[PDB]
């Protein structure tokens, strides 16, 4: 036959294979440098739209310098410096001998600290482990002309701290130029002598014959050079530590760069190479302005790239290095002047974002900001371009958008801000976590204040291209990024809008939803352009272009299905929402969850707003059944079946969204009731508990399709028993566990309560557990085994509740009165219901014969006394109550059954004490 | 309103609240600020019920607009004009461009 | 590449052709004869759609003409309801079961639009009028008679498509009656 379970289970599994195929696209996105590593010649691939809404950088706010610091500038006698410590959320400024730490977060808190000596440079480093009190979250290093100081930043909470001086050591008159640290707490210094130094500091004395707890070492003074001054070195002008490769770098005042290993334990200082960028450049320009060039700066290239560092020229020309060779050169954009004589003074790079400040007047800098802009790479990884054999051999796949600002006050430092946890995502995969991440903020500190500068996401840049209201720029965007990904971003904007919001019950989960940064006009402009760019699902044939080497039999080419841009955009949104979940285990080998409550709520909010999108977009037309596929004219049946398979696959995706919400919801509920107490106690087998670190969110989604009580049911199994064993209200928690994740549960809790009464006896508590057990049965009527429940009430002797229960359950077997109307042609529904009501009123007759039998058993044993009269009264008074409880019922068949029992007991007196119409 | 909540009659809760807060909306009065904090409680503590009814979605949209209009007049009546502009922009009831 | 105008695309062109001419003309009943445009347009889309697949018959909206005459030409749904009563009473729709099922389905989806535009107590007093109620009950009785005449020849999806319609028509008559007795309170 057709089988609707098999069809749904095959649809669900094919939609899981479709999500695996999309999630491995989200994972496999290629490094764009791999194409470019072998280009000799300068790079110039700058993207622009001719329209300002395409800006990949925006200034968010400016904040001016606090008046203490500004009056400090009006009183500066020799020197200023400016600096940034996002590693504590502070700026720093030093004016001669005073150091200021300023809060650029919305507390404004200034902290001033005075020294007895003019400041040379300042830096912030992670302390050596076990070396201070554990409340010392950071160490600040302050150099002067005469000394170097270690201040422990000792914390009272997360935002405020003590500036505790702990150790000092002389400069030896060595002017310190730069200062860099490690996650082991090593501290390096560069000198104007061209040496690199380290600080041996420790909690307790460095050597058993000494009192040294701080000591300075020269790491680049070879033991013969102290006896032969065979030239000076150069001054060193920058130090950088690549943690992720374990490498120190140093830049010298002739552009010479040196590289040192620190070892994979922080174990060493081991020199590897000197690099000579001006010679490396002139070597290329002799194997196919400039005589004034120097390297201004070095910066790190992300660990995941073959490039290791960038070096930057006094021209905006960027030089991308492997440890082996210079491996790419990149020109500035034409926002740097055609005269070739711009005063570029400051240069910064982090993870695919680049800045140059260049002086324009004594009061203004031009800030040119470029971002790596993935459009061709994103497009060609999702959309198979039908334009075969395009000769990509010369195309420079490092596309950048260039942006431009003018800024009053001299730009003195730039950093990236700590608005995201764990690690920054490498630039060519920002798209994979875009919806989980905040925009990438930068902080630009100058001689007047602090400029806050966000890099836009591809969703935020689509929001600006939609607020332009320009139909051509939105059409340009859809064909620049690809219709699959622009559709995925329109779906993201809808999830960020007010109207997508299905609420959670705030009465249990308070407020934590996706911040609604997208207006209704932008969300349904995005929906309108998503509809206009969708297209239909259609079959095609893959044209396998045969190489001309003979007939020997061809393959049979298949027809294959292209789904719509709306389906592929949904599948490219859903795969990103699930990317952090799908491939990961939900439970640590420590016995706790892998995610936090805030993370679970943010995944829950993405999936609920996407569930809302499916039923508001109308991609699944409401009330249509699963389309039953069978096993000029023919090319109608092509779209006729393509549209059936898209509707099937959309239903499969909806079922996976709903079950992904149900799993997140169950792990939220299991988090409240102490997840680890539920996990360690659970009925789950010990060699399953030894492998839950191997069980993924993906594999849990499959686990009930293949009783086999799944791992989720075996945690509900321990939650329900934990609530019971603490006497907690189990029913408040269960209404949630049935709206988010009735009869069958509550029929067990009635049986559980009645098995407490049958264990502990009759008392005001257990006799309430009888009242409660009636009201719970009635609230699930008639969906239970009445006779098995009546024998529990009879075993308790709680008789008075059985008559109402057997009458209500008889009403809910026929809530249309069909058995009350006599028919000369009875329906087989009427015959069935009449037999069911006759079987439920037979439980009242079972009770009445039980009570009469107990009376007769006791009277056959009291064979020599008097006092049994009260037992005789109370037994007949309970029988009269059970009679009156049925005489109130309008069901004639209950009446004719009680009348038949009164007559068979010979109790003909009682018919004179009754008046209901059926008696006649 | 607390009595209409005790019987879960959420259409009437939104009907009363919108009717009394609209007449009070711009007023510098104790009843306006008391009813506005009560409305911020009816938001936090009941919105998951107040949005799930098959009637009154427009009465909830109005409640979710009035609880932003009170926040706009809060800032206007306290000279916070840049924050007030940002409240009425993100209310979508006015045009920002032609 | 013999460009396939879809059953959507034929309706999309025809709706645009009717609405954009109606917008300069209405209420000129000489140059925009609404009852004739309905009675011929619905008959031409019936004749075109009859020979199509049971999923080309799922590009077709029931309110394909009836929304656009309100949405663009600003013809009232009350005025459209009696132009469709006139179409069903006067026209050749009484000659074939499949055509009478089609136009009676469009009429009840037009009444489903009207039930989403009714606001006032006065409108609830028109929709509960004996003449509207008795037309709805005649239309349901007619459709329900012809449906059970054809429940032996129709296929098991198109049968369900009509059973899902009957439960709407029974609800529409229930709304004309609830709007009648919400008048005594």
């Amino acid at each position: 036959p057709f089988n609707k379970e098999e069809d749904l289970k095959k649809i669900f599994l094919n939609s899981i294979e479709s999500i695996d195929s999309s999630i491995d696209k989200v994972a496999t996105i290629p490094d764009p440098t791999l194409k470019v590593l072998y280009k000799r010649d300068p790079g110039f691939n700058y993207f622009d739209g001719g329209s300002y809404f395409w800006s990949t950088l925006v200034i968010e706010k400016h904040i001016e310098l606090p008046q203490e610091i500004t009056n400090g500038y009006l009183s500066t006698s020799t020197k200023s410096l400016l600096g940034l410590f996002p590693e504590i959320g502070r700026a720093w400024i030093s004016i001669d001998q005073t150091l200021y730490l300023w809060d650029y977060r919305d507390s404004g808190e200034l902290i001033s600290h005075n020294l007895s000596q003019i400041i040379t440079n300042c830096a912030l480093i992670q302390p050596k482990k076990n070396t201070f009190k554990d409340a010392v979250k950071k160490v600040m290093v302050v150099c002067t002309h005469v000394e170097i100081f270690l201040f422990a930043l000792c914390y009272s909470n997360e935002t405020k701290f003590e500036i505790l001086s702990t150790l000092s050591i002389p400069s030896d008159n060595i002017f310190i130029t730069d200062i860099v640290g490690t996650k082991e707490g090593r501290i390096f210094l560069s000198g104007q002598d061209g040496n690199i130094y380290e600080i041996e500091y420790s909690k307790d004395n460095l050597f058993w014959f000494s009192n040294e707890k701080i000591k300075k070492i020269n790491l680049t003074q070879t033991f013969f050079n102290s006896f032969i001054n065979l030239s000076k070195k150069k001054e060193i002008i920058q130090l950088i530590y690549d943690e992720d490769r374990y490498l120190l770098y140093s830049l010298s005042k002739d552009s010479t760069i040196n590289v040192y290993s620190l070892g994979k334990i922080g174990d060493k200082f081991e020199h590897l190479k000197t690099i000579y960028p001006i010679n490396d450049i002139d070597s290329l320009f002799n194997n196919n302005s400039r005589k004034n060039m120097v390297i201004m700066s070095i910066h790190i290239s992300p660990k995941e790239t073959e490039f290791n560092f960038i070096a930057i020229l006094s021209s905006g020309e960027r030089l991308y290095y492997t440890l082996n060779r210079l491996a790419y050169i990149r020109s500035p954009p034409n926002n740097v002047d055609n005269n070739g004589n711009s005063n570029i003074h400051y240069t910064y790079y982090s993870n695919g974002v680049f800045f140059t400040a260049s002086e324009v007047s004594d009061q203004e800098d031009r800030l040119v900001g470029t971002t790596l802009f993935g459009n061709d790479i994103i497009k060609s990884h999702y959309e198979t371009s039908k334009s075969g054999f395009s000769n990509q051999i010369s195309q420079d796949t490092l596309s950048e958008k260039s942006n431009l600002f003018s800024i009053r006050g001299r730009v003195s430092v730039i950093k990236e801000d700590i608005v995201n946890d764990g690690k920054p995502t490498v630039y060519y995969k920002e798209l994979s976590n875009e919806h989980m991440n905040t925009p990438r903020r930068f902080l630009c500190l100058n001689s007047l204040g602090l400029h806050f500068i966000s890099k836009l996401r591809y969703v935020d840049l689509l929001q600006n291209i939609l607020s332009s209201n320009n139909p051509q720029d939105i059409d340009n965007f859809f064909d620049a990024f690809g219709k699959i990904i622009a559709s995925s971003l329109c779906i993201s904007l809808y999830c960020s809008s007010p109207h997508s919001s299905i609420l959670l019950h705030d009465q249990v989960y308070s407020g934590i939803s996706i911040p609604k940064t997208t207006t209704t006009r932008i969300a349904d402009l995005a929906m309108t352009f998503l509809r206009r760019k969708s297209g239909k699902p259609q079959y095609y044939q893959p044209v396998v272009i045969q190489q001309m080497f003979g007939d020997m039999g061809a393959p049979v080419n298949k027809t294959e299905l292209m789904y719509s841009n709306a389906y592929n955009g949904l599948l490219a949104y859903l795969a990103r929402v699930l990317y952090p979940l799908w491939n990961q285990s939900v439970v640590t080998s420590a016995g706790c969850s892998y995610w936090s409550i805030v993370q679970l709520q943010l995944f829950q909010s993405h999936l609920s707003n996407l569930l809302s999108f499916l039923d508001i977009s109308q991609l699944i037309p409401k009330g249509q059944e699963i389309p039953i596929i069978k096993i000029s004219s023919n090319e109608i049946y092509g779209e006729d079946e393509a549209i059936k398979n898209e509707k099937r696959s959309l239903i499969g995706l909806k079922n996976i969204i709903v079950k992904s919400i149900q799993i997140l919801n169950l792990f939220l509920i299991l988090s409240q009731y102490n997840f680890k107490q539920l996990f360690d106690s659970s009925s789950i087998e010990l060699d399953i508990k030894r492998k839950i670190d191997l069980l993924k969110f993906r594999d849990i989604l499959n686990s009930d399709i293949l009783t086999s009580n799944s791992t989720l049911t075996l945690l509900i199994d321990s939650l329900m028993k934990t609530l019971n064993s603490h006497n907690i209200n189990i029913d408040q928690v269960s209404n949630q566990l049935e709206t988010e994740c009735k009869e069958n549960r509550e029929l067990y809790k009635v049986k559980e309560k009645l098995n407490m009464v049958l264990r502990d006896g009759s008392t005001y508590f257990t006799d309430s557990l009888v009242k409660d057990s009636a009201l719970i049965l009635d609230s699930i009527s008639p969906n239970y085994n009445l006779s098995e429940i009546v024998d529990l009430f009879i075993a308790i002797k709680a008789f008075n509740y059985v008559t109402p229960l057997c009458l209500q359950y008889a009403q809910d077997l026929d809530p249309r009165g069909i058995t009350l109307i006599p028919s000369n042609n009875p329906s087989d529904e009427f015959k069935l219901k009449l037999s069911q009501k006759k079987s439920t009123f037979q439980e009242i007759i079972k009770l009445l014969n039980f009570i009469q039998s107990d009376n007769n058993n006791n009277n056959n044993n009291s064979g020599g006394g008097g006092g049994d009269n009260n037992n005789y009264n109370n037994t007949f008074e309970i029988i009269d109550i059970i009679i009156q409880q049925v005489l109130v019922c309008q069901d004639r068949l209950a009446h004719e059954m009680i009348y038949s029992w009164i007559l068979n007991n010979g109790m003909t007196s009682k018919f004179f004490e009754i008046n209901t119409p059926f008696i006649t | 309103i607390e009595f209409w909540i005790m019987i879960e009659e959420y259409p009437r809760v939104l009907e009363i609240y919108n009717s009394r807060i609209s007449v009070l909306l711009t007023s510098i009065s104790s009843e306006r600020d008391q009813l506005y904090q009560f409305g911020k409680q009816l938001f936090n503590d009941y919105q998951g019920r107040l949005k799930t009814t098959s009637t009154a979605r427009t009465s909830y949209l109005a409640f979710e607009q009035l609880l932003k209009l009170c926040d706009f007049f809060d800032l206007y009546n306290k000279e916070k004009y840049q924050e007030a502009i940002q409240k009425i922009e993100n209310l979508e009831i006015l045009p920002i461009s032609e | 590449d013999g460009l396939k105008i879809s059953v959507g695309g034929v309706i999309e062109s025809l709706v645009s052709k009717i609405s954009n001419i109606g917008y300069d003309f209405y209420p000129n009943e000489i140059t925009f004869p609404v009852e004739f445009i309905i009675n011929y347009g619905e008959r031409a889309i019936f004749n075109f759609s009859r020979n199509k697949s049971e999923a080309e018959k799922k590009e077709i909206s029931p309110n394909w003409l009836t929304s656009s005459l309100h949405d663009h030409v600003k013809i009232d749904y009350w005025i459209l309801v009696d132009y469709y009563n006139n179409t069903i009473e006067k026209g050749s729709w009484k000659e074939e079961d499949e055509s009478l099922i089609y136009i009676t389905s469009v009429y009840f989806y037009l009444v489903e639009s009207l039930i989403n535009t009714i606001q006032t107590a006065t409108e609830r007093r028109l929709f509960s009028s004996k003449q509207i109620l008795q037309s709805l009950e005649n239309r349901e009785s007619t459709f329900k008679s012809i449906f059970n005449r054809q429940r032996s020849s129709l296929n098991q999806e198109t049968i369900k498509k009509l059973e899902q319609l009957l439960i709407k028509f029974e609800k529409i008559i229930s709304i004309s009656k609830s709007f009648k007795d919400f008048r005594g309170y």
Side-chain angles (χ1 to χ4, degrees), chain C residues 48-78:
Chain C
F48 176 68
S49 64
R50 198 175 189 175
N51 299 347
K52 302 302 214 130
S53 91
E54 304 298 284
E56 285 181 289
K57 299 166 190 169
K58 301 172 181 137
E59 294 191 317
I60 305 175
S61 181
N63 285 347
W64 70 279
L65 179 59
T66 54
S67 97
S68 191
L69 291 178
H70 189 79
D71 312 335
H72 299 285
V73 194
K74 311 310 188 183
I75 311 187
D76 183 1
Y77 283 131
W78 296 103

Side-chain angles (χ1 to χ4, degrees), chain A residues 536 623 625 632-633 635-637 639-640 644, chain C residues 4 6 52-56 58-59 160 164:
Chain A
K536 284 183 168 181
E625 278 214 86
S632 48
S633 43
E635 359 66 65
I636 284 166
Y637 294 102
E639 294 203 328
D640 205 272
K644 289 187 207 87
Chain C
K4 271 179 156 167
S6 65
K52 302 302 214 130
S53 91
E54 304 298 284
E56 285 181 289
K58 301 172 181 137
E59 294 191 317
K160 288 177 175 178
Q164 288 179 312

Side-chain angles (χ1 to χ4, degrees), chain A residues 284-303:
Chain A
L284 292 169
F285 286 93
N286 293 261
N287 274 271
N288 282 4
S289 336
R290 282 236 171 129
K291 280 195 173 186
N292 300 73
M293 286 170 169
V294 295
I295 299 294
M296 297 178 69
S297 64
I298 51 168
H299 290 281
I300 300 168
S301 191
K303 184 217 193 70

Side-chain angles (χ1 to χ4, degrees), chain A residues 400-418:
Chain A
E400 290 178 287
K401 169 59 178 152
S402 50
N403 316 290
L404 175 63
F405 316 97
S406 267
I407 294 184
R408 295 180 181 172
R410 278 278 179 296
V411 175
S412 295
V413 61
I414 304 173
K415 268 191 175 177
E416 196 166 342
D417 194 20
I418 313 186

Side-chain angles (χ1 to χ4, degrees), chain B residues 70-81 83-84:
Chain B
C70 290
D71 241 17
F72 160 68
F73 290 119
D74 242 87
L75 296 164
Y76 180 72
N77 298 353
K78 299 173 198 170
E79 301 224 274
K80 282 174 149 285
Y81 303 113
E83 298 157 73

Side-chain angles (χ1 to χ4, degrees), chain A residues 590-603:
Chain A
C592 302
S593 60
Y594 188 84
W595 301 292
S596 73
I597 299 178
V598 183
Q599 288 167 348
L600 292 170
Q601 288 170 293
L602 194 145
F603 290 117

